[PDB]
Design goal:
Chains A, B: The active site is at 89 (for ompdecase activity), 91 (for ompdecase activity), 94 (for ompdecase activity). The structure is a homodimer of 256-residue chains. Chain A has 256 residues and is an alpha/beta fold. Chain A has helices at residues 4-7, 15-27, 40-50, 69-82, 96-104, 110-113, 126-135, 158-169, 212-218, 228-231, 236-255, and strands spanning 31-34, 56-59, 85-92, 116-120, 141-145, 174-178, 190-193, 201-202, 208-209, 223-226. Bound molecules: 6-hydroxyuridine-5'-phosphate (2 copies) and proline (4 copies).
Chain lengths: 256, 256
């Protein structure tokens, strides 16, 4: 297994993946904050304070009550300052002709500020082809949702294999996966895993949690995505540090 | 087979489905306009002119460059005047805790103006449970995506069956399907079919077209969803009338 820093140099690495892997190695973090808040001020205060602890900040722009493109300008300033990527977890999942407009346009102009987006594979490869028309010229990357953390997920077996094939056939734009585990044997692909908490359990709407040690160390993923385990804690900085140290040590132990 | 007007009276009918079926019968239309435009003025001018010809107007609010909640107030005025439902084709597809916020909140406040939304079933039933927390109190309905019109769709076989079971187990909120065909034998459920044009073909991003006669008459669906076949035509009113007459006659011929 190569280190994150060595994977950043792989011949077929995507530039967005390379940038991410280099800052993960530099900062000793494989934590993605899931900034699931409704106030711009809270989003930005979290991004500033937790920026040094994270490799990535994941947004849901469509829950932000006071969204403006100026909020996103300020978030980019923090991402550049503290060195993390912005991942809009939009889960594009329509026909190619529709998703290109949803990615470039409307109020959110997602492609203008998001380093990474993601897509469901269920609609077939046209979803990727439509997003790539906007994202390739803008030097962006995309993650495919190969496995989901929720109870009753149908993203198993042949579905997961289809996601891996779609990614591997669109490597110009697709840089990895949302998954619960390593799903590709190709080290150029990232694996990002949500459904992570230090304690066992779930929520009352189908979320299921596994620990950083389980998903990084045993299941072979690269990055943990953590929302409520950090955002519901009183001291979100120390919570982020706990998650960072857990994910980083699990990675080091698996690298050996 | 019961008429639309008789299905509107079925004991287990959802109120939103009943309202829709009654106005379909009254107006002799089973056409849903896919209003895939980026200008509010064009959206509203289409809704006004085509309102008498349609049972439903399908939106993608996230491609509207000049979205405001006031645009949606004006769209509701037209929907009430001309008697059609508003369907936001948001394709919710996240964990339950996330989709409830995406449905109620953010800039779009979708639940405040959309009679209908839809969801992908891949994340498991938590997607429906989260949307129902917001939609049931607001008297809304939801469609589940059981089949997709795009090339490479993975919404086949066991996936389609899982969508039908999920709908049938959440009938308080789920009123039907996006599908290419009749997928449920229960007449309380609606079937809405996109990927429709009078002429054969597709697009260059995986869209595939079938005719109104095929999807209503042979495949047993209830409603056709038509975008470019109407919106790219010069005279969008006469195009809508052609599609309305095609879908309505195919329905009458199958009812016999
Ligand atoms: O499989 C997936 C994919 C996701 O994007 N997510 C997202 O990751 C976050 C999980 O948040 P939390 O840690 O609070 O449960 C949410 O923003 C959710 O939308 C997920 O939980 N499971
Ligand atoms: O299976 C599906 C589901 C959809 O919502 N759609 C939507 O229906 C519309 C199809 O538009 P058109 O008729 O221009 O191809 C688009 O808005 C698309 O997002 C689809 O085409 N196929
Ligand atoms: O599931 C378990 O037992 C352990 C306890 C903490 C998280 N994983
Ligand atoms: O299962 C639960 O309810 C709590 C909160 C998530 C971790 N343990
Ligand atoms: O596919 C076909 O042959 C016919 C021609 C018009 C639409 N259906
Ligand atoms: O296939 C095509 O390109 C045209 C446009 C849709 C119907 N026929």
């Amino acid at each position: 297994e190569l280190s994150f820093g060595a994977r950043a140099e792989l011949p077929r690495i995507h530039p967005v993946a390379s940038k991410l892997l280099r800052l993960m190695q530099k900062k000793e973090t494989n934590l993605c904050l899931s900034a699931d808040v409704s106030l711009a001020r809270e989003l930005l205060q979290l991004a500033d304070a937790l920026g040094p602890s994270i490799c990535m900040l994941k947004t849901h722009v469509d829950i932000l009550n006071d969204f403006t493109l100026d909020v996103m300008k300020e978030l980019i300033t923090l991402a550049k300052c503290h060195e993390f990527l912005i991942f809009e977890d939009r889960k594009f999942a329509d026909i190619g002709n529709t998703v290109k407009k949803q990615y470039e346009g409307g109020i959110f102009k997602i492609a203008s500020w998001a380093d990474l987006v993601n897509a469901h594979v269920v609609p077939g490869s046209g979803v990727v082809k439509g997003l790539q028309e906007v994202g390739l010229p803008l030097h962006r990357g995309c993650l495919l949702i190969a496995e989901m953390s929720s109870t009753g997920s149908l993203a198993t077996g042949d579905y997961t294999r289809a996601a891996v094939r779609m990614a591997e056939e669109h490597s110009e734009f697709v840089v990895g996966f949302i998954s619960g585990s390593r799903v590709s044997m190709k080290p150029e692909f990232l694996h990002l895993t949500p459904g992570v908490q230090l304690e066992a359990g779930g929520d009352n709407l189908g979320q299921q949690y596994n620990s950083p040690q389980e998903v990084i160390g045993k299941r072979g993923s690269d990055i943990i995505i953590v929302g409520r385990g950090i955002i519901s804690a009183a001291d979100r900085l120390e919570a982020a540090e706990m998650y960072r140290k857990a994910a980083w040590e699990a990675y080091l132990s698996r690298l050996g």
